[PDB]
Structure 1
Amino acid sequence: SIPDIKLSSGHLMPSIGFGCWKLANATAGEQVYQAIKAGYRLFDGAEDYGNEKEVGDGVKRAIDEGLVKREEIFLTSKLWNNYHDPKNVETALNKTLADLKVDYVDLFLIHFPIAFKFVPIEEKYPPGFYCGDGNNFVYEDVPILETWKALEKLVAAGKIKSIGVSNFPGALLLDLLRGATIKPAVLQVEHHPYLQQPKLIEFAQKAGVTITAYSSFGPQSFVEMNQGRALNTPTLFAHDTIKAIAAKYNKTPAEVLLRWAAQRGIAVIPKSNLPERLVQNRSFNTFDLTKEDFEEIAKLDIGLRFDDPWDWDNIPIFV
């Protein structure tokens, strides 16, 4: 039932996944197990999320029960910022493999086009914004391409099946494509009615790069983090344009918001933190939006970005 998308690398990636950011450590395993029982097969995780050991427990538990085999589960992870230097890339990937308890991850992405100064894993893991000097941010001179080549070597070594990037603007992705032997199979960016970036999406899809949207419900996710910007933003669930389209097809606003992406070939990985949501978030491909619908939603685009490195330390990623 859940459509697969064929990546430029030859492997299939489910179009509907399970988000693991801010997935509580104490219940991470159980939630992953339930998601697997509910039908999810792609798990979008990350070194920075700090819950890979658990995500691993969930997947292993399902595998041990015979519900699924390793090849049926699609595991996505992300290289955190302190590990861009080539000499530390495999190290970080190993930590990820050890925590997830597997021989390979299906998708590994450069989490951010930012290079924090390396912090040994034994000193602090996950490091988050720590750069080895108290609260200060510290960076290291590592061009993306260097990190990317380190990743290509790891694909040949069999530790990764497909590699990609996250939070990359158009210019950066274009340049990376000039030096890449293995083309980034995936581009994972914040995508929702308030931040549509139609041109970025067009370029990437045309280049054969698969788009995975994150924070498909816009401000919601950051509201849960008490972020001021998100709090001051009218929810997409209660937006007049969204409710209308929802009523028209007798669907829920949440279903329209996910369909809006899916129908354009964009993979989604919603955070389903309630049994009911687990079902809701993978059964929305039951209707089609019309051109008129898309034009109406396209109007909501105001370039409102909630996940912005500029907020951390004025990093110019999206300026």
Structure 2
Amino acid sequence: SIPDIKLSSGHLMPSIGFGCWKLANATAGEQVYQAIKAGYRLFDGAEDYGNEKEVGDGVKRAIDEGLVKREEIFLTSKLWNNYHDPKNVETALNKTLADLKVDYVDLFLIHFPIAFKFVPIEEKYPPGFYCGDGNNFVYEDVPILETWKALEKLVAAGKIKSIGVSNFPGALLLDLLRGATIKPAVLQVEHHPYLQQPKLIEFAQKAGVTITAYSSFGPQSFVEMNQGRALNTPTLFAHDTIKAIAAKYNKTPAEVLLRWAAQRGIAVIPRSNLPERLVQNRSFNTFDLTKEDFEEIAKLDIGLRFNDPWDWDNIPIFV
């Protein structure tokens, strides 16, 4: 029932997954276990989320009861900023494999085109914005291609099935494609009605790169973080346009926001933090949006971005 997408790497990836950002460590396993019982097979995690160990417990439990087999679960992780230096990539990937308790990951992405100064794992993990000098941000000179090559070596070693990037703008993705042997299979970016970036999507998809959208509900995710920008932003759930369309097909505005991405061949990893939400977030492909619909949602685009490194320390990623 949950459609698959063949990545450029030849491997399949579910178009509907379970998000692991802000998934409390205390119940992450229980919740990952439940997600699996509900049909979810892909889990979007990351080293920065600091719950790969619990996410692992969840997957292991499901396997031990015989509900699924390793190859049926698609695990996605992300290399954090402090580990871009070629000599530390495998080290971080090892930690991820150790916490997840697996021999490989299905998808490993460059979390950010930012390279923080290396902080030994034993000193602090996950490092977060810690750069080894108190509260100061510190960076290290490591071009993106150097990091990508280490990743390619790790793919030949069988430690990673598919590799990709996250939070990459169009010009950086183009330049990585000029020196990549294995081309990025995925581009994961903030995608929602307030930040559509239609040209980026068009380029990537035309380039054979698969798109995975995060924060499909826009500011909602950051409101729960008490962020000034997101709070000042009208929710998509109560927006006249989304509501109208939702009423025309007799659906929920939530189902509309996800269908809007799925219908265009984009993968989603909604954050289901309630049982009822687990089901809803993977049962939305029951209707079709018309050209008119897309044109209406298209008007909501104002280029509003919630996840911006510019807020951290003025990192020019999106400027």
How many angstroms apart in 1 are the aligned matches of 2:35 and 2:254? 18
| Distance apart, 1:277 and its partner CA | 0.2
SS in 2 for 1:234: coil
Q: Secondary structure at the match of 1:87?
A: helix
Task: Tell me the SS of whatever aligns to 2:316.
Answer: coil
After the TM superposition, which parts of structure 1 deviate over 2 Å for at least 4 consecutive aligned residues?
none
User: Which whole-Å CA distance do the structure 2 matches of 1:55 and 1:270 have between them?
Assistant: 16
Aligned-pair CA distance for 1:24:
0.2
Distance in structure 1 (CA, Å) of the matches to 2:12 and 2:58: 22
Name the CA distance, whole Å, in 1 between partners of 2:186 and 2:34: 27
Deviations 1:74-119 (A, max 9, x none): 0000000000000000000000000000000000000000000000
Once the 2 structures are TM-superposed, how far is the Cα of residue 71 of structure 1 from its aligned partner? 0.1
Q: How far apart, in 1, do the equivalents of 2:140 and 2:264 lie? A: 38
Q: Partner residue of 2:33?
A: 33
**C-alpha distance in 1 between matches for 2:103 and 2:119:** 24
The alpha-carbon deviation at position 68 of structure 1 amounts to 0.1
TM-score normalised according to structure 1 size = 1.00
**TM superposition shift of 1:159:** 0.2
SS at match of 1:78: strand
The alpha carbon displacement at 1:281 in A equals 0.1
1:6: Cα distance to partner? 0.3
Q: Distance in 2 between matches of 1:238 and 1:4?
A: 31
CA separation in 2, counterparts of 1:47 and 1:127? 9
Q: How many angstroms does 1:295 deviate by?
A: 0.2
Deviation at 1:313, TM superposition (A): 0.1
User: Tell me, what secondary structure is at the counterpart of 1:179?
Assistant: coil
**Match of 1:187, SS?**
strand
**2:296 match:** 296
Say yes or no: does 1:179 pair with 2:167. Answer: no
Listed as ranges, the gaps of 5+ residues in structure 2 are none
Matched position secondary structure for 1:180: coil
Partner of residue 10, structure 1:
10
CA shift at 1:136, angstroms?
0.1
What TM-score, normalized to structure 2?
Answer: 1.00
Which deviations, in whole Å up to 9, do the C-alpha atoms of 1:94-153 show, x marking residues without a partner?
Answer: 000000000000000000000000000000000000000000000000000000000000
| Structure 2: distance between partners of 1:57 and 1:153 | 28
> How much does 1:284 deviate?
0.1
Deviation track 1:264-293 (CA, whole Å, cap 9, x = no partner) reads 000000000000000000000000000000
Superposed CA RMSD: 0.2
How much does 1:249 deviate?
Answer: 0.1
* 1:200-240: CA deviation from partner (whole Å, max 9, x where unpaired): 00000000000000000000000000000000000000000
Distance 1:67 1:135 in 2: 45
**CA-CA distance at 1:72 after TM superposition:** 0.1
- 1:5-30 CA distance string (max 9 Å, x none): 00000000000000000100000000
Could you say which residue in structure 2 is the equivalent of 1:132? 132
* 1:163, distance to aligned residue in structure 2 (A): 0.1
1:181-211 Cα offsets, whole Å, 9 max, x none, are: 0000000000000000000000000000000
How many residues were matched structurally?
319
> What's the secondary structure of 1:301's corresponding residue?
coil
